[PDB]
Structure formats: structure tokens, C-alpha cells
Amino acid sequence: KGPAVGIDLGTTYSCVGVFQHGKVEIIANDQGNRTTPSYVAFTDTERLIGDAAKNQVAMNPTNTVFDAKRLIGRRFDDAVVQSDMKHWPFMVVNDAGRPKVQVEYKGETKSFYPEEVSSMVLTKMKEIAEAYLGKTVTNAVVTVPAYFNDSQRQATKDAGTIAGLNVLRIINEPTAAAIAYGLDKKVGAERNVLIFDLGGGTFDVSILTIEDGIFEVKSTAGDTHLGGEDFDNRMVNHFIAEFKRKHKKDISENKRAVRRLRTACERAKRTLSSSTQASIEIDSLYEGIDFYTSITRARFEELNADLFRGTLDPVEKALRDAKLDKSQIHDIVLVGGSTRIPKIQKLLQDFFNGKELNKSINPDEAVAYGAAVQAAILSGDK
Numbered sequence: 407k408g409p410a411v412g413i414d415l416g417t418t419y420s421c422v423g424v425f426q427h428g429k430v431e432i433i434a435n436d437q438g439n440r441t442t443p444s445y446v447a448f449t450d451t452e453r454l455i456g457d458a459a460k461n462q463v464a465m466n467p468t469n470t471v472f473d474a475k476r477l478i479g480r481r482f483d484d485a486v487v488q489s490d491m492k493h494w495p496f497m498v499v500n501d502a503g504r505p506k507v508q509v510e511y512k513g514e515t516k517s518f519y520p521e522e523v524s525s526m527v528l529t530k531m532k533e534i535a536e537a538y539l540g541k542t543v544t545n546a547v548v549t550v551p552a553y554f555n556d557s558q559r560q561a562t563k564d565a566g567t568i569a570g571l572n573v574l575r576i577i578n579e580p581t582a583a584a585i586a587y588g589l590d591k592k593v594g595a596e597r598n599v600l601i602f603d604l605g606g607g608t609f610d611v612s613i614l615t616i617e618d619g620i621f622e623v624k625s626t627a628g629d630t631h632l633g634g635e636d637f638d639n640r641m642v643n644h645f646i647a648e649f650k651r652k653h654k655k656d657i658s659e660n661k662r663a664v665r666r667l668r669t670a671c672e673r674a675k676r677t678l679s680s681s682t683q684a685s686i687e688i689d690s691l692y693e694g695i696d697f698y699t700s701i702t703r704a705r706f707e708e709l710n711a712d713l714f715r716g717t718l719d720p721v722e723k724a725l726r727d728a729k730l731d732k733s734q735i736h737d738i739v740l741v742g743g744s745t746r747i748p749k750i751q752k753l754l755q756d757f758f759n760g761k762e763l764n765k766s767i768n769p770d771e772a773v774a775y776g777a778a779v780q781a782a783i784l785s786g787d788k
């Protein structure tokens with residue numbers, strides 16, 4: 407038993423919540439973080455997961471694993487797996503039709519099914535909740551993309567059982583997100599909700615119709631390769647070029663420097679959702695040279711402008727596929743870290759002619775939050 411937890415097992419970041427005393431507690435990890443990166447690192451001594459794993463990525467490119475969700479419940483020959491393989495710095499191999507991640511670990515070669523990597527991320531998530539709860543955690547609602555097929559669902563469920571979790575339910579991320587706002591508890595006459603989920607690596611738009619607490623996916627739209635990482639990349643390019651003019655050199659081909667630069671860019675991006683200017687500071691970036699710079703919000707918004715404006719296309723598409731008009735949407739919910747960008751909130755709001763957004767719950771926590779809630783309903787404690 408214990409309390410049952412909600413866990414958003416995310417493409418790039420995951421989050422665990424628990425409903426207690428009438429309230430969801432989004433649980434902070436060991437580093438104080440309310441979301442934890444979906445990273446697994448192998449070194450010659452130890453196995454790292456989350457913040458630890460990501461914190462050393464620039465140092466250990468080829469043995470740090472991530473993106474395991476893009477492999478979950480799929481076969482090695484899947485054309486999606488085949489193109490994806492070409493951007494990961496880690497080695498992916500075929501095991502009798504099944505993809506496996508191949509790493510070096512303590513000097514030995516080892517290999518893992520997606521559901522095993524995802525099981526390690528769910529372990530770190532279980533242990534977060536347990537350290538907060540001072541209890542063993544056993545029961546969990548785990549979330550998945552609405553477009554997820556029965557096999558993808560089943561492998562995630564197995565990710566759970568391998569982490570030593572009993573998965574009370576696999577629920578769609580955009581439904582969780584609607585639940586966290588209490589949208590499944592309105593008044594009779596059926597409602598239309600749009601979930602606008604812009605994450606680290608993926609963009610999903612969902613239209614959900616809610617009839618007396620029952621939830622139906624009318625349409626889903628989006629882009630499997632649009633997310634915060636892409637805005638970070640437009641920044642890396644700005645900065646690679648900036649070093650050329652300032653310091654008369656080209657860092658492009660140094661893996662480590664470009665990664666370290668990636669990390670500073672990601673962090674400065676987060677600051678620009680709150681401030682109009684952000685500083686970058688990197689001791690000894692390329693051959694001894696220190697990099698000090700800044701980036702304004704206007705220039706961030708400039709490097710990314712097509713990407714941000716373009717997020718409105720899947721919105722029109724999803725509205726078209728749901729046989730719905732703009733004016734027929736009752737709530738718009740923001741899900742995903744990137745929806746904290748004021749520009750994107752401006753595009754989305756303008757499109758909906760001034761309609762208010764549901765944005766009071768941190769968008770990178772709304773999935774886990776609704777899942778925490780649904781988990782307490784499924785345990786009886788709600």
C-alpha cells in the first residue's frame with residue numbers, strides 16, 4: 407500500500423507527485439529539483455540516474471543514455487528507430503529484432519532494453535518519493551503519450567514492474583493534465599479542452615472531450631522532434647558564431663565544448679522566461695579561453711521565431727481533425743517546460759483571441775500532478 411504516487415515518465419524530464427492531506431505535493435529530488443532528467447550514465451565504477459547522470463554528460467558522451475522513450479515498445483527496424491539512431495552519441499544494436507542500448511560499464515560491455523532504461527528512471531523516481539515519504543512506495547499511476555499504442559503502453563507497464571512498482575493504471579499525459587486542473591469535474595453538458603504540451607524533445611497538442619467525467623481523445627497533433635532542445639540548439643549556433651567574431655576561432659568540432667555550451671544555453675533560456683537578459687559564463691571553453699557573454703530575450707525570440715510561430719500549425723490541424731472551431735474550446739491547458747516562454751504564451755493566447763490559459767500549475771509538473779491525483783482515487787484515498 408503506502409500512498410500511491412503519480413509519475414510522469416518523460417522523454418527528457420520526469421516528475422513524481424503524491425496526493426496527501428487533500429493536496430498534491432510535487433516532490434523535489436536530492437538536488438532540490440522538482441523534475442529529474444531521464445538520463446542514465448554508466449562509468450567505470452558506478453551507475454548514475456537523473457541529475458547525477460546529466461551533470462556528467464559532456465564528460466562521458468558515449469555511455470550516457472537518454473531518449474529511451476523514443477525506443478520504448480518498438481522494433482530495431484522501425485524506420486523511427488533507424489533515423490533516431492543517427493543523432494544519439496550512444497551505440498544502439500539489434501537483439502533478435504529488438505533495439506538495445508549498448509554501453510561500457512566498469513570496463514565491461516553491457517546492453518539494455520528500453521523498458522530497462524525506463525525502469526531505471528522509474529527507480530530514481532520511486533526513490534525520490536520514498537525519501538520524501540519515509541515509506542516504501544509500491545503503487546503508481548504512470549503516464550504516457552495519448553498516441554502511445556498497446557505495445558508502448560505494455561513496455562512502460564513492464565518498466566514499472568521491473569522497477570518494483572505496481573502500476574494501478576497507464577493514463578494519457580494530456581488527460582492527467584486536465585485532471586490536475588479539475589476539468590474532469592465540471593457540469594454535465596460536455597466540454598472541450600486543448601492541451602498544448604511543448605516539452606524538451608516533443609510537441610503534442612491534444613483535444614479532449616469530457617462527458618460526465620469520461621475522457622475522449624478527439625484529435626492529436628504535433629511534432630515528435632520539436633521542443634526545448636531545439637531552442638537550445640539555435641542558441642548553441644548563435645554562440646559558436648559569436649566566439650568566431652570575438653575570439654577568432656571555431657569550437658564547432660569540439661564535442662565537450664559544444665555540450666558544455668549546450669548546458670549554459672539551456673540554463674540561460676530558463677532565465678529568459680523571467681528576465682529580459684541572461685548571462686553565460688564558461689571557464690576554459692575552447693583551448694583555455696573563457697567565455698563570458700549575454701543573450702537578450704528579444705534575440706532569443708529572434709533566433710527561434712519560426713519555431714515558435716509554427717507551433718500554431720498543429721493547433722489548427724488538431725482543431726480541424728476534431729471538427730471544432732477556436733471558439734468551441736473551453737479550456738486551454740499549458741503542459742511542458744517550454745510553455746514557460748512568454749512568446750509562446752503570447753502566440754497561443756493571440757490565436758485564441760485573448761482566452762485565458764490554465765497556467766497556474768507549473769507546466770512541467772501538470773502531468774505528474776494529475777497522475778498523483780488519479781493514483782489517490784485508485785487507492786481509495788480520494
Ligand SMILES: Nc1ncnc2c1ncn2[C@@H]1O[C@H](COP(=O)(O)OP(=O)(O)O)[C@@H](O)[C@H]1O
Pocket residue numbers: 416417418419420441604605606607608633634635672675676677679741742743744745746747769770
Ligand atoms: N523556465 C523555462 N523557460 C523555458 N524553457 C523551460 C523552462 N523550464 C524548463 N524549460 C524547458 O522545458 C523542457 C522540459 O520539458 P518538460 O515537460 O519538463 O520535459 P518533457 O518534455 O520530457 O516532459 C526543457 O527543454 C527545458 O529546458
Ligand SMILES: [Mg+2]
Pocket residue numbers: 414416417579605742773
Ligand atoms: Mg512531458
Ligand SMILES: [Mg+2]
Pocket residue numbers: 431432
Ligand atoms: Mg513543496
